[PDB]
Ligand binder design. Structure first.
Ligand SMILES: CC(C)C[C@H](NP(=O)(O)O[C@@H]1O[C@@H](C)[C@H](O)[C@@H](O)[C@H]1O)C(=O)N[C@@H](Cc1c[nH]c2ccccc12)C(=O)O
Ligand SMILES: CCCCCCCCOCCOCCOCCOCCO
Ligand SMILES: [Zn+2]
Length: 371
């Protein structure tokens, strides 16, 4: 039990020191690189027991484990929401305000935060009661049904999100008739993309930052770029579809989900895993998920994150190359420079920090490839 606890905590500190090291190398570049390089002249000018206590003053005794688990889920997410709030306010209303990006008031910010928290609970708790029940009621192969249920939930959520969740938080409007709407339609036909409707999301209610999303096409209103540049960026986006990157990501995530539920099944009988974290008299299923998925699986989670980051960089070069294929390299080149400027991206990075962290290859590497 001591080896387990100690190893989780030492791994945490080790990752933290590695990431502090990397961050320092990147911060050094910001303080050091004080004029435009020549490669760039043309590019820029306890809680558990507390939850039981709430349960028993409402008339629910310890035998009601899922109930206590749902209380814990509420308090844990509330605690994390509350401790994140000072930081999010400072980033939005000091950093983002200072550099010209924030567009929202404090009242919008708090309305938004409460709504996101409520909607999260509306989905999280019912789904959690069922998943926990499934785990309890189906071994020795419970993990197959646990996996299948999370796959179905994931599928439902993704299928309803556009119509039923997203409009609670953002304003979507059809792209107006004009020259851009028609060239998008031409391009979509050209690749057999069954384009249905083009929408514009009013991101400017929040921020002047811009970002294109991956059926329907949704474009930020802050995306700005002239029409031929929007089209090359769409060309790139549609490359993620033609090349099957989205399907590969879905398969990876469900294979990973299968593997973790299997290993959870292997490990969840080990009472030493619970004792490591102060659970002596009981082994609640949810606490089990927490310990195994977040603490015990720690090294695997880190290696996989890193592997997905490398893969992501590879997919981005491939999507750029698909837009080149479509004949849009010159416009994509232009588009990436202008978005880098509107969003104030700094186009020099430390090679180690960027290898570890960047899901998108540095701008200069993307421009060279488009040439
Ligand atoms: C051609 C480009 C305008 C659109 C293109 N979008 P795309 O790569 O297809 O997809 C984006 O990146 C993926 C990693 C994510 O999984 C997606 O959710 C999405 O954020 C892109 O290169 N996005 C980069 C570049 C970028 C767009 N807006 C930004 C704002 C700040 C910094 C960088 C950007 C990004 O996500 O960052
Ligand atoms: C006995 C092994 C310690 C070797 C690695 C040092 C870990 C330091 O990271 C701490 C960073 O996080 C700040 C909060 O933790 C402070 C306590 O760290 C003391 C490490 O013994
Ligand atoms: Zn992309």
């Amino acid at each position: 039990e001591k080896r387990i606890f100690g190893a989780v905590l030492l791994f945490s500190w080790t990752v933290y020191l590695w990431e502090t090291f990397l961050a320092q190398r990147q911060r050094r570049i910001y303080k050091t690189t004080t004029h435009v390089p020549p490669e760039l002249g043309q590019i820029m000018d306890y809680l558990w027991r507390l939850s039981g206590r709430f349960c028993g003053y409402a008339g629910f005794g310890p035998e009601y484990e899922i109930t206590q688990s749902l209380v814990f889920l509420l308090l844990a997410t509330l605690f994390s929401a509350l401790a994140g709030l000072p930081w999010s306010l400072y980033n939005t209303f000091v950093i983002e305000e200072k550099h010209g990006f924030n567009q929202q008031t404090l009242g919008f910010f708090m309305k938004d935060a409460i709504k996101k928290f409520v909607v999260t609970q509306c989905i999280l708790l019912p789904v959690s009661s069922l998943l926990l029940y499934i785990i309890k009621i189906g071994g020795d192969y419970f993990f197959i049904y646990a996996w299948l249920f999370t796959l179905v939930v994931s599928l439902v959520l993704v299928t309803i999100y556009a119509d039923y969740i997203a409009p609670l938080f953002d304003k979507f409007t059809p792209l107006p008739e004009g020259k851009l709407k028609e060239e998008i339609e031409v391009m979509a036909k050209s690749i057999d993309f069954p384009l249905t409707k083009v929408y514009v999301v009013e991101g400017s209610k929040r921020s002047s930052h811009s970002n294109a999303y991956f059926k329907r096409i949704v474009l930020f209103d802050t995306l700005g770029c002239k029409n031929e540049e929007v089209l090359a960026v769409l060309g790139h986006e549609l490359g993620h579809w033609k090349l099957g990157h989205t399907v590969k990501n879905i398969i990876i995530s469900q294979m990973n989900s299968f593997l973790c539920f299997f290993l959870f099944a292997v490990l969840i009988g080990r009472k030493e895993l619970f004792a490591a974290f102060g659970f002596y008299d009981s082994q609640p299923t949810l606490i089990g998920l927490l310990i195994i998925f977040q603490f015990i699986f720690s090294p695997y989670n880190e290696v996989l994150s890193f592997c997905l980051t490398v893969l992501s960089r590879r997919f981005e070069f491939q999507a750029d190359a698909f837009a080149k294929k479509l004949g849009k390299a010159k416009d994509l080149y232009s588009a990436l420079i202008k978005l880098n400027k509107d969003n104030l991206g700094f186009p020099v990075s430390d090679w180690l920090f960027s290898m570890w962290h960047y899901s998108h290859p540095p701008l200069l590497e993307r421009l060279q490839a488009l040439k």
